[PDB]
A paper describes a structure:
Rotation is driven by a flagellar motor, which is a supercomplex containing multiple rings. The C-ring (C = cytoplasmic), which contains multiple copies of protein subunits called [name], [name] and [name], switches the rotation of the flagellum between counterclockwise (CCW) and clockwise (CW). The switch is also the site of torque generation for the flagellum, through an electrostatic interaction with a stator called MotA/B4. The switch also connects to the MS-ring (MS = membrane–supramembrane), which transmits both the direction and the speed of rotation to the flagellar rod.
In one of our CW switchΔPAA datasets, we observed density for a binding partner within the cleft in the [name] subunit. The bound protein moved both FliFC/FliGD1/D2 of the inner ring and FliGD5 of the outer ring, as a unit, by ~10 Å toward the centre of the ring. One of our CW data sets showed density within an ~40 Å cleft between [name] domains, identifying one binding site for regulatory proteins. The size of the density is consistent with a globular domain of ~120 amino acids. Because it bridges FliFC/FliGD1 and FliGD5, which differ between CCW and CW, this protein should be specific for the CW pose. The local resolution for this density was 9 Å, making it difficult to identify the species from the maps. YcgR and CheY could be docked, while quinol:fumarate reductase and FliO fit the density poorly. Thus, we cannot identify the bound species.
Residue numbers in the entry:
A (entry chain M): 44 to 330
B (entry chain F): 514 to 560
C (entry chain G): 3 to 168, 172 to 324
D (entry chain N): 45 to 137
E (entry chain P): 55 to 137
F (entry chain Q): 57 to 137
Write the structure that this text describes.
Amino acid sequence: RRVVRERLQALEIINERFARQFRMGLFNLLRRSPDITVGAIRIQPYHEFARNLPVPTNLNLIHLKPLRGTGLVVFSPSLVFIAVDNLFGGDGRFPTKVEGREFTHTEQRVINRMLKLALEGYSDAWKAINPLEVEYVRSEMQVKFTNITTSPNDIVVNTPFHVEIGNLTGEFNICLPFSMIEPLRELLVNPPLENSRHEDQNWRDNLVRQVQHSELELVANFADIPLRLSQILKLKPGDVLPIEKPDRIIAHVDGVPVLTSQYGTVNGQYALRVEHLINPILNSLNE
Amino acid sequence: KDEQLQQRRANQRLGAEVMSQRIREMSDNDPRVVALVIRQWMSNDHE
Amino acid sequence: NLSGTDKSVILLMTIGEDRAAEVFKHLSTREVQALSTAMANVRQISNKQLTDVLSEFEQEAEQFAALNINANEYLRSVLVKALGEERASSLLEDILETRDTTSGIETLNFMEPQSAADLIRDEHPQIIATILVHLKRSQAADILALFDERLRHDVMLRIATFGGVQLAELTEVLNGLLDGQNLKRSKMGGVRTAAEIINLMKTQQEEAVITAVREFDGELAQKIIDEMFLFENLVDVDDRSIQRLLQEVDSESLLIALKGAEPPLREKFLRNMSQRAADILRDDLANRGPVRLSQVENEQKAILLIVRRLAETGEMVIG
Amino acid sequence: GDVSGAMQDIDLIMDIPVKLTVELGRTRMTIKELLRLTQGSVVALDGLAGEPLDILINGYLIAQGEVVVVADKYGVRITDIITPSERMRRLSR
Amino acid sequence: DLIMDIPVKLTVELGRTRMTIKELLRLTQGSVVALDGLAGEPLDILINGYLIAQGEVVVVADKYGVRITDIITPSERMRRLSR
Amino acid sequence: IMDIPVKLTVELGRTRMTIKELLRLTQGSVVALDGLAGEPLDILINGYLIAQGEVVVVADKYGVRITDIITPSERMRRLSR
């Protein structure tokens, strides 16, 4: 039983700008402008991702310090074939498909350069918001040997991309376990923040100045006695229920206590004499 | 075998000459190190 | 013997490590280790020999070296200095790769086309196309013929598509191919040697192993039996060849081997006799009974040895 | 069954403990005021002296009552049970 | 029964275990603890900490829904609290 | 310092309505709560909360994947709700 549902905002634009940077990199590398189409971000269990993964393919381990665990990036044999023939300058209108056959040394080396180019692109894109170092670990041919997740049912988030160079097309995906982004669960959901310069800080302080005159109502409680609905039903108006000695009055707003106080008879009114404001920071300091 | 002994003395003189030839080879290795490397490449090409 | 390679080797083992290091960095691993062994074990030292070696070195210095500045030894460093002084583009390094690539292209032309194909079949078809374009036309046609039909057609189609003529990526492509033959040559496949080894074995054990490999893989066993085959049928062996061998082979040896051989073999071997020789051989076959099978097999092995000798001569294609 | 469920609670849920709460009064007071307030400050409430205190359970209006000092032991004595119409009128404010 | 319309607070639990405070001392912030109720057993349904009944959660209509199965059964309540 | 066994408690969400809508539904009636699929649960000791954490099943037995001690901050919100 593993079900997780969430929505994210920042990672979409992060992937978009990463794809634009990657397109620029491939353009300058292969002297030809490519086009990268970012697919809808895929959230699926690790076993589902492995099943959807087109075998054969090349899987790459890229650690993300200081977060525990290793990231994963995959590329299609068609994509690597097209990129390497564009490196050769060949048209590639009579392509070959290799299945089961391991990549040659030249093919794996071209994979190495394109892997490091993708790593640099994603690094600049990510550090543009949050600096998290990425370090490649080990390439892999089969998904089962990658075994990043503890269980195949572990949910992994995947970002698919559709890359084309003229007539030649292709698709590659960037998949990551949910545990990897678990520490930054809040930072992925919200969209990035504009500004955050000194002015923004003082603007936030100015917002507190406007919020200084807020609107709130306090609640005073005396007794919370545990009784029964049988007693309530047999209770009738005029009945008196004894109460233990209320040595203090608890004041709370919407539930959260704010202070304690003592009742007092002032100017013929139900007046309360405060003792001290109950602050979470004060309680933590006392503890 | 006095002639053989004279030949052995000549061989000892030849050995001294061989040491001088080795010193000349060492001098070729020593002076003009660039030229020594060029001759190394030339002998490799001739090989 | 003392070849130009051997003369340089003697020079090196005579001079020392000061020039041996430069020779090694300009040289290849097997010759480096050969000179290391020569240094480890040396018995070619003589008072006159060393002086003659110095004279030969002086000759190389005045001729091969012509007393010139370091050739691409310290020059390449000043070339790199100029490269650094000029734009930040290691074109000289690319030219260095191109030098190995062009030499490798020439080597590719020299070396076996089918081995080149199987070394390039795994590589990219565009790699095959561009390398075939850059190679000699004859070598290209040989590799084209040795390719399968579909791969060959794809290679020629991508040759037609090949117009990028790229620029330093092509050099490292050849460098990778050279590194995939740069590894120890090996070539110990001996497709013929199994057959050769079984022929070197006894004939009964040869037949037993032939049956065993027929059980193992009829294909491989049949290939081994073909490697056993040596002048068994006239049409493949060629009559002119049966004519030429058997006049070189002793007539009595042929007779002894034939009376233990099959009648078709006897007829096909005697069809290239002078008619008098054929009649004499047949008459003696009728006269004398089958001599010891050991002697018959000895004569058959002598026949095969003479076949191998003429194969060494290489004037005609045996079978 | 709907009738069965209604019938059940009269016997099955007849014996069941519950909780309650009581309020004193309400006053408008903002964060400026609370920050200005200090130790020993006295704050009044709209509840007039002697007014019965509203009695609620889990935040649900139930009744009103006033505390009486009996045997030197405080005890709230309820005085009425809120009708649905009066509850509607109270919340329509 | 004018007090019929009263919001009640319910409590649903998985299982119990008698662990000493020393166990929790060594149990890290990401530790795993088992229970006494076997998997698949209907989760006990309680209100305000008072035993009521049991039920099983099922993934229906894209939400976790507990299925009421047993009744309060005061004799069974007595037997259960006799533990 | 002195050690003693103690009763724990895990709570799968809390709703807001009368029990009548629940008890009118007879046995075999599936009802959902604010507890949905995905959120980590909470652990209480003798009714006193400690920490938050999802619960998984292992070896045909429930296994809690506790996360971290609940701070008074979110303790206030969960007390309010």
